[PDB]
Design an enzyme around this catalytic site. Structure first.
Site, short mmCIF file in Angstrom:
data_model
loop_
_atom_site.label_atom_id
_atom_site.label_comp_id
_atom_site.label_asym_id
_atom_site.label_seq_id
_atom_site.Cartn_x
_atom_site.Cartn_y
_atom_site.Cartn_z
N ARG A 1 -23.54 -18.55 -37.35
CA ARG A 1 -22.21 -18.57 -37.94
C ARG A 1 -22.28 -19.28 -39.27
O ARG A 1 -22.76 -20.41 -39.36
CB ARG A 1 -21.18 -19.27 -37.05
N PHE B 1 -17.82 -24.08 -46.02
CA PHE B 1 -17.29 -24.96 -44.98
C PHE B 1 -18.37 -25.44 -44.02
O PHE B 1 -18.65 -26.63 -44.01
CB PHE B 1 -16.17 -24.22 -44.24
N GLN C 1 -23.56 -23.06 -38.60
CA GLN C 1 -23.78 -23.52 -37.24
C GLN C 1 -25.11 -22.98 -36.74
O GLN C 1 -25.61 -21.97 -37.23
CB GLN C 1 -22.64 -23.04 -36.36
N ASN D 1 -17.99 -28.91 -31.28
CA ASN D 1 -17.17 -29.14 -30.11
C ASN D 1 -16.16 -28.00 -29.95
O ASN D 1 -15.80 -27.32 -30.90
CB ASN D 1 -16.43 -30.48 -30.23
N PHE E 1 -24.13 -28.14 -36.36
CA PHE E 1 -23.87 -27.45 -37.61
C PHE E 1 -24.10 -28.35 -38.79
O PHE E 1 -23.89 -29.56 -38.73
CB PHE E 1 -22.45 -26.89 -37.66
N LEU F 1 -12.25 -31.88 -40.07
CA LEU F 1 -13.10 -32.10 -38.92
C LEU F 1 -13.27 -33.57 -38.58
O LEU F 1 -13.99 -33.89 -37.63
CB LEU F 1 -14.47 -31.49 -39.17
N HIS G 1 -15.69 -34.22 -34.47
CA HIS G 1 -17.09 -33.88 -34.27
C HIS G 1 -17.94 -35.11 -34.54
O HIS G 1 -17.54 -36.02 -35.28
CB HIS G 1 -17.50 -32.72 -35.17
#
Ligand SMILES: O=P(O)(O)O[C@H]1[C@@H](OP(=O)(O)O)[C@@H](OP(=O)(O)O)[C@@H](OP(=O)(O)O)[C@@H](OP(=O)(O)O)[C@H]1OP(=O)(O)O
Ligand SMILES: [Mg+2]
Ligand SMILES: [Zn+2]
Lengths: 167, 444, 175, 261, 55, 170, 52
Positions: free
Chosen positions: C55, C60, C63, C102, C113, C122, C126
């Site tokens: 991903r 941003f 992952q 998460n 990530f 975030l 996380h």
RNA sequence: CGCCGCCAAGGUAUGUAUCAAGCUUACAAG
């Protein structure tokens, strides 16, 4: 957390007190909010005695994070107690303490020219900080009642309003 | 200075309410304050709180109001951003020359982020240089060096960042500023740099001077030396700043024509970097004689190495004695190696601040001899230029003429050629006088 | 200077060789102990070999750590998912940060990530457990190619071909 | 100099750096009044730089002349404004480097300078800006300079006085003839000719540009104000109005015949 | 470290550390003499000394 | 690909910047205070010597000047947002204080820094298919037999009642 | 600066008017003066006509 | 035989009419 609560209580929100105790406008304040937001010496003298203790506490927390050592900390807060005025701007709001700024700078010479007696060298390292610590405590010895009283009048006038034609 | 109509006979006889009739005229009061701005605003008297103006980078060490009102009208119409954009577009446009490098594929002006020009605590990359493959870049060094060993990470893309700053008489050394602040942003963690390579360029608006400190992929450093000496020499935004200082300051020249300044080597000699001229033509020189016998032969009498500082008038005259004209071989061909040793000995003998940043020799025969004898000093540029000077006409003036001829030793004397002209005129004009006097003695 | 690193010092480093290059993640072992123990334990198992980066939200996050490749398969060395380990000096202010991924509550597995920019949404969601040593942040910016084909998962994602442990605090064994 | 460079035309291209360097250095000079020679030379050689494919150096000395206009010498500033006028002509108005959004506000306090040369060049420039660049303002700003153009009458040169009435016409076509006209009708009680006949002319200009039936009810109204000067003013403005409009008087003759009787 | 008594408000408003220092004056003067000696020997024998970057 | 150096020592300084040195001016040995100190010293050593003309340097023929910055102190920086601009002369062209006004006399309404910050965060007659869509004089494309019946209704057009004048074309 | 003892002025003042508006106000002022003086004298033969 | 080290106000008006958070009690109550 209480100098910032005065600012949030007076609904300013265009001044920013940061974690090292400065106070900065952010908006080129128009003249109806230039006049509501200026503070006296009871706000600013407390802000700079807290900036002084924030520097001393940041020195010890730099030591106990472990990324500076004991000789270097001792030279650190000797420089802090000797060179306030250059790093707090507290004299600006209460100028009688400029004497004590000078009294640090005077006695610094006493210590700093007996470290350098003999083969020791003219650089940094004079971590003998008792004699500046003492006089900036003897300041607070008599600035406790005065700006406790100044803040008493400040918190009174904030929490019960000023009296127009009383006294 | 000002001449313009403070008398103002019948001014244009206007109405003048009250405060414009009797109040004090603020404008000479603030042009005086503008004029001594480096010493009224010096960075290191109390070194505590400083406040930078918005949209600029000036930092104001003090609560002086009149100084702030003087220094805001000459950065009036967003002009800090405008100088940033002008020089960054001029030296992205000087990289239309792409194939004369290894190559350059594209020179991407990155997205025009406002407030970059005066965000001092952080920085971005300003123009990014892509490549086909593997610019083999250097280690970071100034653009006042020469060494440039150039053995480091072979990288694709190479950014260039440009920084602007302001004067203030205690920190006007941007050889040091570009170094310190390149290191600061390249070891930072708010940095948005696209590669570990590229250069940061610092320029110093008041006291206008420039340098950089990054690492150097091969054909870049001598390119951008000329490419931004031309920008400092001529740039429209960094010219409207110049004349807007002059108009907010009321200064005017008083000469008819432009004072001999051009793209001549005359003109960058006087940027307070120490430059030396070197004449080595008269190392070997032969007298003209008739002997007892009618035959005609040659005598290798003692010769001269002239070394000349144009800013101070100091003339380092090295004597080269007759008696080293025996024993050696290829006598007309070994002086070029026995000269650079003595000149580097002069470099080593002088103090640290007096030695040059650049040495300008005469007609080229010593660029590699000075390069191999200046191994102990990497950062000296040795150049041959088109200000050839008649120091041979210095062997026509009698105070030099007897002293060069009658010597028993490699004597190494010193003279001063600007006698007491620097009491009254500048180095610039005394040099323009001296080259007239030497060329006039030379041709006749 | 004036630049102020402003985050706690690291301990323990793992070099990790993907097809985009070598990435040397160095860990905040003291500030986030269970997640760093998870990560060096799985890297020491060679759990992450041939695992893809499934991903990429360019700008941003990116992952990884899904050996099934769909976005849900992660098996910690605790059996059950473990607890989030926040810190007030570990926040998502910059690129190069590495954080466990998460799905709500204390659900941290292998799936982690990189960040690619500023990620203030975030914060306190996380567990940051490592930064990336510079000159190799560009190898993980190679991982953000605009190839995404979808809202996620480009054509040929980079696979983790090896995973070294350059420094190992807190003694362990693999399985 | 101007005739020579106009003759050389495009062959003067490797001399524009020499000339523009000589002029830009020449424009400091002890303040010693060889700065209207430099600015006049810019106004004369402004023509040859567009027809020789040079707009970069036009954009270079436009912004320089933008801040030589804070002078105290009037005859320097008049030649500055002449040069800047010639540049505003030889470049477009909407594509020039000290743009008109922040050039005209520099010109509004220049307009209060009572020297004749500075007034003359300033309203020639304000006229070209006011018809061709009226979108670069507040439209409050045109209102606060059409109170400046009443004092910019009573100017002893008659070229100023006939340019300022044109600028009233253009300001009116920008912002409408109900604000500029109340200004010109308060101007009709002054006691001074050169200041009432040349606002009467301006009433006829704002009439004929933005059609009468926009001025003629209010101008018909202010005959009822019992002062000699305002009544002779509205009759003189009807004189200049009918003289200007010509064959459009077929529509307005029945409206003014009960006035003239 | 020097842990020290304290006196804090239940709201967490303010935390007064509640102690007068009280040193025995010969041992205190001798402790400062001790580190006068040790700190001279550290400034003499440091290769170059750096202070703190003070905020 | 940038290959790593592959060593376990972390990325940066050991003190984590707690001795950051402020090295933005001329360094200690080349600083003008140090040059002054050199001149002072060498004039103290040569005292019994009387013009031995070995020249020694410029200054030395017989702590002021550019003063050294404290290396160990970052200066606390603010922004002086509040511009000194006559509000009058900015938006009017006239200050009542003339040139005695203590503010700038600027007229440029360029944005402030904080303003840039807080923008920076943000057929058709019969309505059938075109059965020979065919034209008239003046762009009017109608269906063929439907516009013939339209001419049977009214001789002029449907869009703007323009005179077809009998003229009808594809 | 003496911010206390400088010749003061107020912001947004608009300034002192030119000669034309000043002496027009002088003529209107003098009209009001003569009207009130003949009103005090109660003169029944003063007439002002249709044009001032 | 070696003074000295500088903040704030005093200028960019104030006075009205509609539109939320800041702060305020979390109450008396068929
Ligand atoms: O106050 P600073 O300029 O930062 O330097 C002070 C001090 O200054 P004052 O004496 O003006 O208070 C002296 O240095 P100078 O007077 O020579 O500038 C002092 O005495 P020495 O110089 O004889 O040591 C010593 O300076 P040094 O850096 O040489 O120790 C010391 O420095 P600190 O700032 O580290 O206390
Ligand atoms: Mg007043
Ligand atoms: Zn003003």
């Amino acid at each position: 957390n209480m100098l910032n609560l005065l600012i949030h209580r007076k609904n300013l929100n265009y001044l920013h007190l940061d974690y090292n105790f400065n106070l900065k406008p952010v908006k080129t304040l128009t003249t109806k909010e230039r006049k509501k937001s200026r503070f006296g010496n009871a706000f600013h003298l407390c802000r700079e005695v807290l900036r002084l203790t924030k520097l001393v506490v940041d020195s010890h927390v730099q030591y106990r994070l472990g990324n500076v050592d004991a000789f270097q900390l001792a030279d650190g807060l000797q420089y802090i107690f000797a060179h306030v005025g250059q790093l707090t701007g507290m004299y600006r709001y209460k100028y009688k303490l400029m004497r004590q700024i000078r009294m640090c700078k005077d006695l610094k010479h006493l210590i700093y020219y007996r470290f350098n007696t003999g083969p020791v060298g003219k650089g940094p390292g004079c971590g003998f900080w008792a004699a500046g610590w003492r006089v900036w405590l003897f300041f607070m010895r008599g600035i406790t009642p005065l700006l406790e009283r100044w803040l008493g009048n400040l918190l009174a006038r904030q929490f019960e309003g000023r009296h127009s034609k009383g006294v | 200075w000002e001449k313009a109509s403070g008398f103002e006979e019948s001014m244009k006889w206007k109405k003048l309410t009250n405060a414009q009739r009797s109040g004090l005229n603020q404008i000479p009061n603030r042009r005086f304050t503008l004029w001594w701005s480096p010493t009224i605003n010096r960075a290191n008297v109390y070194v505590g709180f400083q406040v930078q103006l918005d949209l600029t980078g000036i930092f104001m060490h003090g609560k002086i109001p009149t100084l702030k009102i003087s220094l805001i009208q000459i950065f009036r119409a967003h002009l800090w951003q405008k100088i940033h954009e002008s020089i960054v577009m001029d030296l992205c446009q000087v990289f239309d020359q792409e194939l004369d490098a290894l190559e350059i594929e594209t020179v991407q002006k990155e997205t025009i982020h406002p407030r970059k020009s005066y965000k001092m605590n952080s920085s971005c990359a300003d123009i990014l240089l892509f490549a086909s493959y593997k610019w083999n870049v250097s280690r970071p060094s100034l653009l006042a060096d020469s060494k440039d060993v150039m053995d480091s990470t072979t990288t694709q893309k190479y950014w260039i960042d440009i920084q602007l700053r302001w004067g203030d008489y205690d920190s006007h050394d941007i050889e040091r500023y570009a170094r310190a602040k390149f290191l600061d942003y390249t070891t930072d963690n708010m940095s948005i740099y696209p590669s570990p390579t590229g250069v940061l360029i610092a320029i110093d608006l008041a006291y206008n001077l420039h340098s950089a400190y990054g690492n150097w992929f091969p054909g870049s450093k001598p390119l951008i030396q000329q490419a931004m000496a031309k920008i400092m020499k001529a740039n429209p935004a960094l010219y409207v700043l110049r004349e807007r200082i002059r108009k907010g300051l009321q200064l005017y020249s008083s000469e008819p024509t432009e004072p001999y300044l051009s793209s001549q080597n005359y003109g960058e000699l006087f940027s307070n970097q120490i430059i030396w001229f070197v004449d080595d033509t008269n190392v070997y020189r032969v007298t003209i004689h008739k002997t007892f016998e009618g035959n005609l032969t040659t005598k290798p009498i003692n010769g001269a190495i002239f070394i000349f500082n144009p800013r101070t008038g100091q003339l380092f005259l090295k004597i080269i004695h007759t008696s080293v004209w025996a024993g050696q071989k290829r006598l007309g061909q070994l002086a070029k190696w026995k000269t650079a040793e003595e000149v580097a000995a002069l470099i080593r003998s002088l103090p640290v601040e007096e030695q040059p940043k650049q040495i300008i020799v005469t007609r080229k025969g010593m660029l590699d001899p000075l390069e191999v004898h200046l191994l102990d000093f990497p950062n000296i540029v040795i150049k041959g230029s088109e200000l050839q000077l008649p120091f041979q006409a210095c062997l026509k003036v009698e105070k030099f003429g007897d002293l060069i001829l009658k010597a028993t030793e490699p004597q190494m004397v010193l003279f001063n050629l600007y006698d007491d002209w620097l009491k009254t005129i500048s180095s610039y004009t005394a040099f323009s006088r001296l080259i007239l006097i030497l060329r006039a003695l030379h041709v006749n | 200077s004036n630049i102020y690193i402003q985050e706690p010092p690291t301990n323990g480093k793992v070099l990790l060789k993907t097809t985009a290059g070598d990435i040397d993640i160095e860990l905040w072992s003291k500030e986030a102990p269970k997640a760093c123990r998870n990560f060096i334990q799985l890297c020491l198992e060679a759990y992450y070999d041939n695992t893809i980066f499934h991903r990429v939200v360019p700008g941003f996050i990116v992952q990884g750590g899904d050996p099934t490749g769909t976005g849900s398969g992660g098996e910690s060395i605790y059996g059950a998912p473990f607890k989030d380990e926040f810190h007030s000096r570990l926040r998502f202010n910059r690129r190069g940060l590495v954080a466990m991924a998460n799905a709500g509550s204390h659900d941290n597995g292998s799936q982690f990530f990189f960040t690619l920019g500023r990620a203030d949404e975030l914060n306190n969601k996380h567990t940051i457990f490592g930064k990336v040593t510079g000159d190799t942040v560009y190898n993980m910016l190679r991982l953000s190619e605009v190839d995404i084909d979808d809202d996620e998962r480009p054509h040929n994602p980079h696979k983790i071909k090896s995973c070294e442990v350059l420094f190992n605090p807190f003694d362990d064994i693999i399985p | 100099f101007g005739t020579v460079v106009n003759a050389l035309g495009k062959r003067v291209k490797p001399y524009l750096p020499q000339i523009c360097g000589t002029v830009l250095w020449r424009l400091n000079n002890k303040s010693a009044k060889v700065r209207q020679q430099a600015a006049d030379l810019i106004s004369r050689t402004a023509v040859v730089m567009k027809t020789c494919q040079e707009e970069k150096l036009m954009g270079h000395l436009g912004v320089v002349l933008y801040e030589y206009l804070g002078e105290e010498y009037p005859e320097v500033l008049g030649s500055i404004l002449g040069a800047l006028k010639a540049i505003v002509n030889v470049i477009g108005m909407h594509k020039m480097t000290p743009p008109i959004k922040d050039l005209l506000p520099r010109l509004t306090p220049i307009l209060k300078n009572r020297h004749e040369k500075v007034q003359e060049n300033c309203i020639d420039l304000v006229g070209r800006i006011a018809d061709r660049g009226a979108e670069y303002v507040s439209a409050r700003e045109w209102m606060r300079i059409c109170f400046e153009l009443l004092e910019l009458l009573k100017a002893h040169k008659k070229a100023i006085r006939r340019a300022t009435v044109n600028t009233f016409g253009y300001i009116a076509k920008a912002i409408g003839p109900h604000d500029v006209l109340a200004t010109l009708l308060n101007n009709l009680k002054v006691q001074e000719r050169q200041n009432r006949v040349c606002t009467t002319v301006a009433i006829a200009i704002v009439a004929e540009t933005c059609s009468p039936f926009t001025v003629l009810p209010a101008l018909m109204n202010e005959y009822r104000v019992p002062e000699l000067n305002v009544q002779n003013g509205v009759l003189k403005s009807l004189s200049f109005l009918f003289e200007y409009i010509g064959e459009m008087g077929k529509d307005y003759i029945y409206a003014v015949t009960p006035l003239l009787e | 470290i020097r842990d020290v008594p304290v006196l804090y408000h239940i709201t967490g408003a303010i935390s007064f550390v509640n102690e007068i220092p009280w040193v025995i004056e010969p041992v205190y003067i001798s402790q400062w003499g001790s580190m006068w000696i040790m700190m001279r020997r550290e400034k003499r024998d440091r290769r170059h000394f750096k202070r703190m970057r003070f905020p | 690909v940038y290959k790593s150096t592959r060593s376990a020592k972390p990325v940066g300084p050991e003190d984590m910047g707690a001795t950051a040195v402020y090295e933005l001016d001329t360094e200690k040995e080349r600083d003008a205070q140090a040059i002054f100190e050199r001149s002072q010293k060498i004039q103290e050593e040569l005292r019994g010597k009387e013009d031995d003309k070995i020249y020694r340097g410029i200054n030395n023929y017989q702590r002021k000047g550019p003063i050294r910055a404290p290396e160990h102190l970052r200066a606390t920086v603010r922004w002086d947002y509040q511009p000194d601009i006559c509000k009058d002369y900015k938006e009017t062209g006239f200050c009542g204080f003339g040139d005695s006004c203590k503010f700038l006399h600027d007229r440029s309404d360029y944005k402030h820094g904080w303003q840039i910050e807080r923008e920076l965060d943000e057929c058709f007659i019969c309505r059938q298919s075109f059965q020979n869509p065919v034209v008239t004089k003046c762009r009017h494309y109608f269906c063929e037999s439907c516009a013939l019946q339209h001419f049977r209704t009214t001789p002029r057009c449907y869009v703007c009642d323009q005179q077809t004048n009998g003229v009808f074309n594809p | 600066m003496d911010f206390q003892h400088r010749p003061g002025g107020k912001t947004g003042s608009g300034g002192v008017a030119s000669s034309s508006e000043s002496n027009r106000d002088r003529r209107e002022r003098l009209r009001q003066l003569a009207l009130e003086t003949i009103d005090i004298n109660k003169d029944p033969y003063f007439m002002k006509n249709h044009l001032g």
